[PDB]
Amino acid sequence: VVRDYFEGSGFGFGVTIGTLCCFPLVSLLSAWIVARL
Amino acid sequence: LGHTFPFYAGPKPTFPMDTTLASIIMIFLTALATFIVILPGIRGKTRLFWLLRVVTSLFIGAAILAVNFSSEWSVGQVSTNTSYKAFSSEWISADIGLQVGLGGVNITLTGTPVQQLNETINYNEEFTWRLGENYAEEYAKALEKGLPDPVLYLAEKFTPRSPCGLYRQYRLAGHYTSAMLWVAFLCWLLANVMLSMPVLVYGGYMLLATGIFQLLALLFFSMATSLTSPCPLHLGASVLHTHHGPAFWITLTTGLLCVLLGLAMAVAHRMQ
Amino acid sequence: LGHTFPFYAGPKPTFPMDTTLASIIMIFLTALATFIVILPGIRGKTRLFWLLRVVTSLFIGAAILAVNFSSEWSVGQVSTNTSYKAFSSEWISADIGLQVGLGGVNITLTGTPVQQLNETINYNEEFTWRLGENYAEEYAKALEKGLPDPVLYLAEKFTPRSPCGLYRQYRLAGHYTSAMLWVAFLCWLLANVMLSMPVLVYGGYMLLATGIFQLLALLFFSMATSLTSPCPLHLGASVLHTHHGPAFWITLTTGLLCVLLGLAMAVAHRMQ
Amino acid sequence: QNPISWEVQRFDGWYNNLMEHRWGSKGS
Amino acid sequence: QRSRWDPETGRSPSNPRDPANQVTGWLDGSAIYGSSHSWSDALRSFSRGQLASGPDPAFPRDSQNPLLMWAAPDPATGQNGPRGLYAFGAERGNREP
Amino acid sequence: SLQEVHPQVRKIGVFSCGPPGMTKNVEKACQLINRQDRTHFSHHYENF
Amino acid sequence: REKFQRSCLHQTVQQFKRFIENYRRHIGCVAVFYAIAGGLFLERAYYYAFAAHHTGITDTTRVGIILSRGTAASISFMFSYILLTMCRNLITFLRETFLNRYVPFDAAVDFHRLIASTAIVLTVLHSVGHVVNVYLFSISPLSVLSCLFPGLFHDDGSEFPQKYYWWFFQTVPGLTGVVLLLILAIMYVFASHHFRRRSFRGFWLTHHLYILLYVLLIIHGSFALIQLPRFHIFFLVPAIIYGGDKLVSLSRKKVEISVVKAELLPSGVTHLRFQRPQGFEYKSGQWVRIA
Ligand SMILES: *[C@@H]1O[C@H](CO)[C@@H](O[C@@H]2O[C@H](CO)[C@@H](O[C@@H]3O[C@H](CO[C@H]4O[C@H](CO[C@H]5O[C@H](CO)[C@@H](O)[C@H](O)[C@@H]5O[C@H]5O[C@H](CO)[C@@H](O)[C@H](O)[C@@H]5O)[C@@H](O)[C@H](O[C@H]5O[C@H](CO)[C@@H](O)[C@H](O)[C@@H]5O)[C@@H]4O)[C@@H](O)[C@H](O[C@H]4O[C@H](CO)[C@@H](O)[C@H](O)[C@@H]4O[C@H]4O[C@H](CO)[C@@H](O)[C@H](O)[C@@H]4O[C@H]4O[C@H](CO)[C@@H](O)[C@H](O)[C@@H]4O)[C@@H]3O)[C@H](O)[C@H]2NC(C)=O)[C@H](O)[C@H]1NC(C)=O
Ligand SMILES: *[C@@H]1O[C@H](CO)[C@@H](O[C@@H]2O[C@H](CO)[C@@H](O[C@@H]3O[C@H](CO[C@H]4O[C@H](CO[C@H]5O[C@H](CO)[C@@H](O)[C@H](O)[C@@H]5O[C@H]5O[C@H](CO)[C@@H](O)[C@H](O)[C@@H]5O)[C@@H](O)[C@H](O[C@H]5O[C@H](CO)[C@@H](O)[C@H](O)[C@@H]5O)[C@@H]4O)[C@@H](O)[C@H](O[C@H]4O[C@H](CO)[C@@H](O)[C@H](O)[C@@H]4O[C@H]4O[C@H](CO)[C@@H](O)[C@H](O)[C@@H]4O[C@H]4O[C@H](CO)[C@@H](O)[C@H](O)[C@@H]4O)[C@@H]3O)[C@H](O)[C@H]2NC(C)=O)[C@H](O)[C@H]1NC(C)=O
Ligand code: HEM
Ligand code: HEM
Ligand SMILES: *[C@@H]1O[C@H](CO)[C@@H](O)[C@H](O)[C@H]1NC(C)=O
Ligand SMILES: *[C@@H]1O[C@H](CO)[C@@H](O)[C@H](O)[C@H]1NC(C)=O
Ligand SMILES: *[C@@H]1O[C@H](CO)[C@@H](O)[C@H](O)[C@H]1NC(C)=O
Ligand SMILES: *[C@@H]1O[C@H](CO)[C@@H](O)[C@H](O)[C@H]1NC(C)=O
Ligand code: NA
């Protein structure tokens, strides 16, 4: 049997990378909300 | 990409030259490039003269630093057939080179061809006698490491206890030559700073002092390395003879240029 | 006087305590003596309060430095009969002490009496796990040196590869406790500087921060050394138990004093 | 052909034993 | 006066002090050619594969550099210096005729 | 012309506060006139 | 009088010569700053590309480790020395000295933005590099990780490495980096010119997060996972200078005054004539600060 270390982690790793890249987007969303208010 | 080991299977690179000399060259070329970019901002006719002044000053500083850190003062090189390693009777045809600097000596063993006895023979070993560093400890560590026989032979030739007194004279010469080269570097810095200031005659005097200190370091190295009893370095069926390397001649040329420029500055000030 | 060798035949002295702690004590006692000499120059009623302020600040700083550099955080000591050296079946009755600090551990082996087996048994060895220092290399050098068996045993108990994970937890605890103690020292310096300035409330806040950082370092050391799996240190027919040493309690008392003084300063400012 | 057909013995006694290179050497 | 000892020894009971041998422990003719390569080079004339000799071919070169030969003063006459001491592989080869 | 209009002056101060190129032009003109030794112009890089 | 030009050659070279002749000081200062940054980056890149073979770090990550470490050195330098651009009292003292002949102190605030404008870019690369590293560390075996990080992993035959989320959220560098990325996102998005036009209080509320950023930068490299933390070495002297400058700014007593007249002068100018404090003595050409 071939042991794969990263099996079952691709989706979560991609989600983590996407959240890291969305940090500026989340900041922009919150800042737009506060600018409107 | 994974699933294989190692992730990078390529041979690891080796830096193609001395890192200290490379760093000096990179820093001074960066300064030169910055000032070349700045050149169009210079006012008028005083651009070619400005360029000459800037390039000359940068060259003087780079020469001081590189020569002080170059292990290329006393150089020699001989092509021979010599025993290579222990537990092996096979001999190698190689160029063995000695490069004695101020703070130590670089022994080079370059195979001819480099690939001999299924091995890569391109050794470039340094043994340093700088203050606070133990040459005997470094030679013992080289013996434990298992360096090739010519390298070990030329290294033990410079041990403090070797019958031929190369170590004492070369350590003294390198130490005081490096001290006076550092003094020359300080004088060059002050020469730049006081050429920035309106008193140009004092800056010319400091440039003259830079040249004088370069000449003094050169003369001290010559005199202290001349007092050596003749150490016969015999490898295979040949004898290696050392001579003043290009660091010595760069010191001479740079010091002569500095003293000439300082004398010209003083005489021009007197005449104008 | 000559004609005999050596010119000085007396036994060479050994410094009677830690050199770092001694230096800290000397520096702060010199500052205290200088300010005591300066005391008559102080104006009027604000001398006893001035004396209390100065002495308290100096004591806080000295406590920070000494505790950060004292190897007296986790202490233990047991009297046993143990094997002493190799190639010798004789045993020694001695007090073996463990003194784990932030940057390493001091293992003490004091004979009872000190003169046993025609030897002086007063060993006080340090093994450091500070950043950049290799604990395994130090233990290997101790093995090559030939340290007595209890010292080697307690030293290998803290090796990175020892089955009981003392090394990892103690290194982490000491590293971050030392970092936060340095932060507390910086806050103490700023507290002095801003108590010199007219804004006393900010200086009181900085003193409060010094106390908070001392408490944080104490708590981190406790938590990180508590997560250890129980390492049974068995020497001879006894087991050595470690406990929070006087460095821990000095940290606690000094941090409580600093936080109390900061709270008092803030409340007095609010009430006046 | 090289007249020196063997491995010349070192003067300092190093590399005489295969695995203990300091054996019999000067300063040991 | 105490002799040279191994710097890695003589500090703790499990590793007591051990003397250091100043010549090669091998029976390798080091008393003839020296215990180091530089010593052997100092002892050679580099001509016809012969050990260096003085004006008389039956005697090696007189010692000149102080690093070469042990030069204990003559107990009888007090004569010192390397003026009459021959150069051998063994540093103390001139202890007696 | 400033030298001509004030013939009895000997030291004239000029102070330039502006972009580096224009101030450099002022200094270069000052040096060019000072090459003639009739009167002295002293120039300052003023940066209020 | 005047002269027009040919657009292709003469006008463009005239504009370029004018730009150099004006902003020669800016060229020199930007060149030396970016030269220091590039020198640190190249030092770390050389160490990890030529002088780190004994560790085997490049047998698993070569591009990632070089990018991360070089950008880490550059980031440490930039975040340490960005405080020097805000030493208002030191800038004021050097604003008139002969150093102004070479250093355009007037553009300090602008330089501030420029430094930040560079830093975040490199910061992203830093994070990006470590992301790559993490993935490789998530597929390397336990033995390789034990060789790379002896003080963090021990090869016991389990043969299975840690997960990606262990690196990202169960390690001091990972947690500190994630929180630092969040802080940078907030600070840079809010402090942008667009939102600084939008609002003023939020700008400072988010821009004062630099103290938390520096605390998390001190903590970030503290674990000494890859190398010993050098950020405090870079941060020490600029922090001391900035603290002294801020303390001096606090020391000065800011007078409170009222305006007498306000004029909306053409070309979008405001003429503010306000009451002089009693002991206000000044010479011509001197400048003040207002809030
Ligand atoms: C004056 O002299 C100065 C001193 O030389 C000089 O300054 C020096 O400048 C040079 C740059 O010009 C620099 O030094 C070089 O650095 C290179 C890179 O250094 C890194 O990599 C090495 C390599 O380590 C790998 O291999 C060893 C075994 O050899 C393993 O133990 C390692 O784990 C590692 O193995 C991995 O990588 C391999 C890559 O293929 C894989 O195959 C393997 O499976 C593994 O994956 C490391 O050792 C270095 O670490 C060392 O140093 C650091 C810091 O000092 C220490 O912390 C650490 O503990 C180590 O001690 C570093 O990480 C070096 O490769 C290079 O070394 C060669 O040259 C020197 C000098 O001659 C030799 O001593 C050395 O043995 C190497 O020579 C062999 O290899 C070359 C080609 O590789 C051959 O041409 C040569 O003939 C010789 O071959 C012989 O041995 C081979 C096996 O080793 C064998 O295959 C052959 O067949 C043959 O038998 C060199 O050191 C550096 O800047 C300076 N050096 C310093 C500061 O020490 C200065 O410029 C001079 N001045 C002037 C004016 O000229
Ligand atoms: C946490 O731990 C920290 C680490 O300990 C601690 O910091 C330390 O503080 C202490 C001060 O409190 C300091 O360390 C001490 O320093 C003393 C002085 O150091 C100088 O002298 C020694 C002695 O060297 C002589 O002897 C050796 C052989 O032993 C020879 O090789 C030498 O050539 C020299 O010999 C001449 O002098 C003799 C004097 O009588 C003559 O008899 C002889 O004929 C010669 O004329 C030197 O070795 C030192 O140099 C070393 O260090 C420097 C710098 O690091 C290096 O450059 C150098 O290369 C050397 O490595 C230095 O010059 C030391 O004497 C003292 O050492 C004793 O204690 C340590 C620790 O336990 C032992 O490891 C060591 O072996 C000694 O223990 C023996 O001796 C004492 C009494 O002498 C006995 O009580 C003890 O039981 C033990 O006896 C055993 O061995 C004896 C033979 O050695 C034997 O006779 C006995 O019978 C028995 O078998 C100690 O190191 C220093 O400030 C710190 N140490 C550091 C930094 O390393 C810190 O405070 C702790 N923290 C807290 C909170 O407590
Ligand atoms: C991590 C990145 C940054 C750090 C650490 C930083 C640091 C600082 C500091 C210390 C101050 C002075 C605060 C004070 O004196 O009270 C300041 C002010 C300021 N910053 Fe930043 N800054 C960063 C990024 C930025 C960016 C991206 C911008 C704009 C796009 C910006 C624009 C400003 C402005 C306009 C001021 C006010 C200038 C003044 O009032 O003199 N900064 N910053
Ligand atoms: C997911 C995001 C990040 C990850 C995974 C990460 C990871 C790392 C790691 C593993 C180190 C080595 C530290 C050590 O060996 O102890 C490091 C160092 C460093 N990182 Fe990050 N980082 C991230 C984001 C950031 C951010 C946002 C910044 C700056 C705002 C930054 C700046 C630095 C600096 C300056 C160092 C060197 C610190 C020192 O040398 O003391 N990194 N990073
Ligand atoms: C080395 O050996 C080769 C072949 O044996 C010979 O051609 C060459 O001349 C030799 N070189 C020296 C310097 O003896
Ligand atoms: C050694 O060198 C020879 C000739 O250069 C070559 O044929 C051979 O493949 C090399 N390797 C080995 C293991 O012999
Ligand atoms: C050590 O041995 C002595 C005598 O043999 C004995 O009196 C003492 O109780 C022993 N101590 C321990 C801790 O075993
Ligand atoms: C050793 O100790 C015993 C008793 O303490 C003492 O009588 C003797 O003189 C000491 N020295 C030697 C060499 O035995
Ligand atoms: Na022998």
Residue numbers in the entry:
A (entry chain A): 583 to 619
B (entry chain D), C (entry chain B): 4 to 275
D (entry chain C): 22 to 49
E (entry chain C): 147 to 243
F (entry chain A): 1504 to 1551
G (entry chain A): 1019 to 1309
Task: Give verbatim lines from the article.
In addition to the shared TMD-DH catalytic core of NOX, the functional DUOX protein has an additional large N-terminal extracellular peroxidase homology domain (PHD) and a long intracellular loop 0 containing two EF-hand domains, and it requires an auxiliary DUOXA protein for proper function. The activity of DUOX is regulated by intracellular calcium concentration. hDUOX1 subunits and hDUOXA1 subunits co-assemble into a 2:2 heterotetrameric protein complex with molecular weight ~457 kDa. Here, we present the cryo-EM structures of human DUOX1–DUOXA1 (hDUOX1–hDUOXA1) complex in both high-calcium and low-calcium states, providing insights into the structure and mechanism of calcium activation for DUOX.
